[PDB]
């Protein structure tokens, strides 16, 4: 059975580029392409693609559910079984929906979060896609209530594979593979179980047009610190003389603050939160 | 005597040729007893030895859940490795893990393991004290910091001292007639002449279990440590193993040479001498 794949991604903007490859008999050999609704009717009047089909610029005509068959000369039919299916979804065909996380984007390891996609546009389906993932976007039917259509995607139990940058999309009836422009991205972070750091303030949590800097430090070797106000900031950690690793976030000229440690090359997983600290103005 | 349980897993990315593949296998001593293969149709841990086949359904549900969890974790670790080593997403890479434990004759814990390789090279390993980690390069040094910040060695220590040893002891009993057996080698010698002045003496050992064995050649007493062609011990396919050792001898001197066979199945080690 040939292995079909889209590169770099099956979710692709109109005007972008995507390559369909058909790997069969240790070769990306000669192959023909088929779409759903065409079944055993080869697309492009039976074009026998040679190496890999570069669709560029991508148009809405490239959207579809594709399978390939590869050349098999010493065979009865001369060709191979149909490959696995690859769904090319073309984005940028409607105005973007909105994406928000309930209760919020910071998710304790093992827990759950709802990513709600919604729009004033009446989308029949919504898709949720984590950036850089080859998995099929998750698909749900749009529910209609009070001038908006929406869909609640349940994410969890939370872990590193589910953290990252998410976008959601809408599509309308009869063109399901033609997706909207992506929603504004939402970063979903898994917190724990790394050891929570400590939060402190300079000169202190009591200020009245005065400036304050909040220090987040730890014995664990965090490379990054993240300061969160209940009502988002990022800074590299510096090796201090206790061998501790600190970062100083200047705030001034209040709020309840927590901070989280983070490691190099791992931007979506943070420590347990520090204990809350209240800056009172 | 002493015994061991090992789980070995291999994770392979193969962009454009297949989805990432995860294969895990469980052994007691030299005897495989389970497998999981992410590409196979069952998506279950499967028995690969008769004596585990009578484990109840809850065992297979529990083991399947854990090995699938491992599959997901190591397939994410492939992605992480690309970032740590600044490698491109087009290449194929290999991520291997081994964990398990040894027990002595008394069934008490002797050693535990929990270690990883990336592209055929040591990556990170749990130390003998089961409390600290050996990181083999700067990328694994990141993992070490994370794992220290998470105190994860505690969970490894708890598994190795309790669950792993408890399972090994249980399996040793389940498969006693096959795991605690000791099949001796059947031996013989072949002779082949190289020239008018040399010949090859090959000492053969076949049908033995476990796979541990010593074949050695001596000439008048001093063993030919660096003149003996040794072949890696190979599986016969029925659960026994085979091995041979050969030495090159001046024709007419075959009587000076003796092959020595040491194996737990032998009451007394064998001293074999070729004769026409």
């Amino acid at each position: 059975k040939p292995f079909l794949s889209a590169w770099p991604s099956a979710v692709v903007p109109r005007g972008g580029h995507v390559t369909l490859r058909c790997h069969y008999r240790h070769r990306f050999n000669n192959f023909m392409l088929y779409k759903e609704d065409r079944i055993h009717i080869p697309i492009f009047h039976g074009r026998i693609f040679q190496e890999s089909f570069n669709m560029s610029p991508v148009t809405t005509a490239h959207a579809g559910n594709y399978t390939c068959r590869g050349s098999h000369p010493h065979s009865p039919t001369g060709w191979s079984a149909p490959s696995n299916p690859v769904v090319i979804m073309v984005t940028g065909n409607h105005r973007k929906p909105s994406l928000l996380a309930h209760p919020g984007p910071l998710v304790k390891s093992g827990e759950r979060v709802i990513l709600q996609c919604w729009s004033d546009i009446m989308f029949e389906h919504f898709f949720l896609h984590k950036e850089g993932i080859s998995k099929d976007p998750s698909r749900l039917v749009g529910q209609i209530h009070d001038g908006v259509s929406k869909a609640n995607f349940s994410i969890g139990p939370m872990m590193l594979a589910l953290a990252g940058t998410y976008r959601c999309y809408g599509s309308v009836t009869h063109t399901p593979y033609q997706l909207s422009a992506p929603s504004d991205p939402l970063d979903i972070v898994v917190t724990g179980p790394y050891e929570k750091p400590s939060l402190s303030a300079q000169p202190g949590p009591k200020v009245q047009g005065e400036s304050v800097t909040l220090s987040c430090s730890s014995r664990s070797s965090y490379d990054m610190y993240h300061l969160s106000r209940e009502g988002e900031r990022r800074l590299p950690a510096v090796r201090k003389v206790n061998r501790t690793f600190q970062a100083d976030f200047p705030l001034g000229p209040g709020g309840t603050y927590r901070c989280f440690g983070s490691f190099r090359h791992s931007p979506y997983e943070w420590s347990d939160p520090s204990d809350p600290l209240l800056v009172s103005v | 005597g002493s015994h061991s349980m090992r789980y070995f897993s291999t994770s392979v990315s193969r962009p454009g040729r297949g989805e990432p593949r995860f294969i895990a296998v469980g052994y007691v001593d030299d005897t495989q007893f389970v497998r999981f293969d992410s590409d196979a149709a069952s998506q279950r841990m499967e028995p690969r030895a008769p004596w585990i086949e009578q484990e109840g359904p809850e065992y297979w549900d529990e083991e399947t859940g854990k090995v699938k969890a491992h599959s997901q974790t190591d397939r994410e670790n492939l992605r992480i490795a690309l970032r740590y080593y600044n490698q491109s997403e087009a290449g194929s890479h290999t991520l291997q893990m081994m964990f398990g434990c040894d027990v002595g004759s008394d069934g008490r814990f002797l050693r535990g393991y929990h270690q990883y390789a990336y592209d055929g090279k040591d990556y990170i390993a749990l130390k003998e004290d089961l409390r600290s980690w050996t990181a083999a390069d700067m990328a694994a040094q990141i993992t070490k910091r994370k794992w220290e910040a998470a105190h994860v060695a505690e969970q490894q220590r708890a598994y190795l001292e309790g669950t792993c040893v408890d399972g090994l002891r249980r399996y040793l009993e389940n498969g006693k007639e096959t795991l605690q057996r000791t099949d001796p080698p059947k031996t013989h010698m072949t002779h082949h002449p190289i020239s008018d002045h040399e010949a090859t003496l090959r000492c053969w050992a076949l049908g033995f279990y476990p796979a541990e064995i010593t074949l050695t050649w001596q000439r008048d007493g001093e063993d030919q440590t660096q003149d003996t062609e040794l072949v890696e011990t190979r599986p016969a396919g029925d659960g026994t193993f085979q091995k041979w050792a050969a030495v090159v001898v001046p024709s007419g001197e075959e009587q000076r040479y003796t092959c020595h066979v040491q194996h737990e199945g032998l009451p007394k080690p064998l001293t074999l001498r070729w004769e026409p």
């Binding site: 872990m159 | 854990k66 491992h70 740590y84 990883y116 969970q155």
Partner: peptide, 9 residues
């Protein structure tokens, strides 16, 4: 008896 392998690199 398999181990829970849950901590990523």
């Amino acid at each position: 008896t398999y181990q829970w392998i849950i901590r990523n690199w």
